[PDB]
Subunit: 328 residues, 3 copies
């Protein structure tokens, strides 16, 4: 039966951007083919040069956002090059069975595996590595991402009416626990293996040293600031595979928000801030109405402005004095 | 106000069972309102909470952590005979989040060793609720010592989905999540005590760090694994009641979902569908309904993976049945 | 156009109390004029006499609750007396544009500014100071409050029927991070700026030393306890500008709760406890049915009974034997 379904290949895109797709499906179910290569690599996470041994899906933190439609089949070819040193796998929160696929995609360096699962539930979901006995270590090393399963007829508001976005961004929020020496400075490591002991110790404090968007402090600012224009409808998919977060668009709102990201549920309206539980992906739809710079943040202002969970939006267009204006 | 004659209502006694199991009950009420009689005996006792053998001075309702799940229907009356045997050393009481008045019953149930009391309250609101000890000035100490449980007030007509249609579970489990703050010494080793009291100062200090040393299901690391793993079969509808009386948690069925979830657990509200993960606020009980479609081992966890796989907030499901290659399969 | 609207000047009142207002709008859109004076001052936050250099809106923590109706224009005159030492501004989560107003309300000591914005979305929202580069420091120093934007036809239940409260209280929850020394004792400073470094270090631990209602431990207890009577309908607006909280009325419930505080959404019913994410304001409606003392708390019992997040309600009326009683 699966053999009768036509197949389509997707070229993934590095976050915060998302690979193109049709919001409203133009055909019946399909088998969507994806391919990701696991890559263990050093990564600089803050402005002081602190670097870690990151574990990534396709070389980025977070991994790329995968997009399909409800009832399509997701077929992922997962590759683990012999240049890596650890065993990895992948767990799809969108999938049903075998620990989300974790127990079927274990691959040591030099191996690859292909997993297929039916996307039976619409919504944005988290996907992350989960090696038996070393789950949080891999996840907090940046090995997580998300997949969006759109309703075949696109998104809908709290009244069944269509909600169409002009652009979509994927913000992966990452909590890091960089080990510190007795002096209070970040220790150095040659391999992911040597850091395990200290990694476990750092994680058990439950106090992140960093909390960043797209892999590093200020990653989504400057030339990498998100963009929009007055009148533009923007969907922002936000995930946190291990810890709670509370997204907030400073100067705006989440007009329609699926805090826990499942589309069969009507969205919450006019959110100033929403809670995305650790191990969940959420989605917020907003129509810009004012130009200028906006800050998108985890509203625990310490986590945002001190630990790194903050990015920017640069919006073009005409200022609306009716909505807001400085009185002189 | 004209009194309501309660003496006319039929009475039924309930024999509580230890978690994660639940005492006998009917989803769809087979009778009209009843005065449901429960009896719990407070028991202060030593308890091993991890594989290394760490032992604490636990404060329990009926000898278990969490306390047993009580089940009644909307508008029944809950009558609890609370006993504090003279073998205990501390003052205790009980606060039902399901009750209205006297601090949930806390102001009417203070009992010292050797005393007992009987409380009755009308379960006017359907949902799963937390119940916990709450002695003035020592509330968090008793609660984080394991003295909390949960009560489920089923709608008289059973559970319903977002469309008002019946949702019937084949089995139910109660997972009580506990955050422990075991004090350690200057060296970093868990300190030991002969009496619950003597450790108060240290307990307060350990708690105020807001950093749990252990976060476990059913009283201890691995309590719901191995021979004590939860079970189900493909096609089975399972309801998992999960409570956390003091700290937030984010349940997740690894390999499954929360088909219908009442994150904050109140049934007059439609459930959230297809949840991958949900947030149950500290001081709240939530419920998740799921229909298994794949056999095999599943992990039920607090999705802060550190709290789950390092601190202990993880349990297992062993499911029987035929594998579905359509839902998921490895490609050759 | 805006010039054709009636203008009304409001006299703000100290929390937990709220200035007089009508729930169902008595007129059409108006320009509601408010005035707040920024005040840097010392504040004792606990029973041990611990004092901090608080940054307040109108001299209190939290700042006062502002009340308007959906589509009214909020016009705020923010005054920064030359007796203060820092620059301040204000960000309204209810406003659209310029970082909620922060980018247009920067005022040094000796300056003032007037901001106007249209309250286009109904619900309770957080407002707080947000100076670039010093956001969490000002917010956790107590510089935050809330504004309620009532639907023009008042509050409604899950079935669209009217919900009218007899009284309303505003509980502002504040997380403080008082720096300590070697000995572990709270340090004191001559000026707020002098302690910037210690404050940053204290905040970065993500562990509050105090979590209080209305500025201090026990602020809403004793003769300052909240009051009600059996049969009374009470709305409790609760905000937390920087950290999550989980309100709970001990002995009662949240009959109708807008956890994330936006009225276009139906309220959640019969809540025992609800989660208000940091950077959000929530509202709970309850009809008291039993007299006596009630405790209103953040239900992380440690934060409530050890750190200070607990208040009291003293309720009058006759006891209801049917709802509860102590048996023979
Ligand atoms: Cu991995
Ligand atoms: Cu997961
Ligand atoms: Cu007790
Ligand atoms: Cu409680
Ligand atoms: Cu300020
Ligand atoms: Cu803000």
């Amino acid at each position: 039966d699966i053999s009768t379904l036509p197949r389509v290949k997707v070229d993934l895109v590095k976050p915060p951007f998302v690979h193109a797709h049709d919001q409203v499906a133009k055909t019946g179910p399909r088998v969507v083919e994806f391919t990701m290569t696991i890559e263990e690599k050093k990564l600089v996470i803050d402005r002081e040069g602190t670097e870690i041994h990151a574990m990534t899906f396709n070389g980025s933190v977070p991994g790329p956002l995968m997009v399909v439609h409800e009832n399509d089949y997701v077929e992922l070819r997962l590759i683990n090059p012999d240049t890596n040193t650890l065993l990895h796998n992948i767990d799809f929160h969108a999938a049903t069975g075998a620990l989300g696929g974790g127990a079927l995609t274990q691959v040591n360096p030099g191996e690859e595996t292909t997993l297929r699962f039916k996307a039976t539930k619409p919504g944005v979901f988290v996907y992350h590595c989960a090696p038996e006995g070393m789950v949080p270590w891999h996840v907090t090393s940046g090995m997580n991402g998300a997949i969006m399963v759109l309703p075949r007829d696109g998104l809908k508001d709290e009244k069944g009416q269509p909600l169409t976005y002009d652009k979509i961004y994927y913000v992966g929020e990452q909590d890091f626990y960089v080990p510190k020496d007795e002096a209070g400075n970040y220790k150095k490591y040659e391999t992911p293996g040597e850091a395990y002991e200290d990694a476990v110790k750092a994680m058990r404090t439950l106090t992140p040293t960093h909390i960043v968007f797209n892999g590093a402090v200020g990653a989504l600012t400057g030339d990498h600031a998100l963009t929009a224009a007055v009148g533009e409808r923007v969907l922002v998919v936000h995930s946190q595979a291990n810890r709670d977060t509370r997204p907030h668009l400073i100067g705006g709102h989440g007009d329609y928000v699926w805090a826990t990201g499942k589309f069969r549920n009507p969205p919450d309206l006019d959110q100033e801030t929403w809670l995305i539980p650790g191990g969940t992906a959420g989605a917020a739809f907003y129509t810009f109405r004012q130009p200028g710079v906006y800050a998108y943040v985890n509203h625990n202002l310490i986590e945002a402005f001190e630990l790194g969970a903050a990015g920017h939006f640069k919006v073009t267009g005409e200022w609306n004095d009716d909505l807001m204006t400085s009185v002189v």
